[PDB]
Amino acid sequence: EFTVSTTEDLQRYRTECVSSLNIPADYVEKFKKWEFPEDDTTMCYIKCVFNKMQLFDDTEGPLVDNLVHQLAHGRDAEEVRTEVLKCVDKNTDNNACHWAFRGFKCFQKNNLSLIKASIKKD
């Protein structure tokens, strides 16, 4: 089942991906600041994190229902879906790392932020 990711999920996934991909220390510092070079190391890191957040599958590609759940904060879901779908394409160069990262870049361009604050009516 799909659950939305928080900052703490992201921190755990970063740690796991850094370990499993043997990411160099200097990349880790950038990643902690949410700064992402457009190189293979970084693109495969983004795929790894999106995999773990169930936002991207290496065969099916971007996972739209899950992305909408992650992005919408329970509001304007059909509008969010419209925006997400603009960012969905096929694996045109047969590199799942590039595929995932292309999605991410399109999210950034369209102001679709996967990790946002939430105000709770207490």
Give residue limits of the domains in the chain.
1-122
**Is 14 annotated to bind ligand?**
yes
How many Cβ atoms from other residues are within 10 Å of residue 85's Cβ? 12
**Is 45 annotated to bind ligand?**
yes
Is 15 strand, coil or helix? Answer: helix
Q: Do residues 42 and 36 touch, judged by C-beta distance below 8 A?
A: yes
In sequence order, what are the residues at sequence separation of 6 or more whose Cβ sits closer than 8 angstroms to the Cβ of residue 9? 53
In sequence order, what are the residues at sequence separation of 6 or more whose Cβ sits closer than 8 angstroms to the Cβ of residue 57? 51, 63
* CA 34 vs CA 28, 31, 89, 113: distances in Å: 10, 5, 24, 12
Determination technique for this entry? X-ray
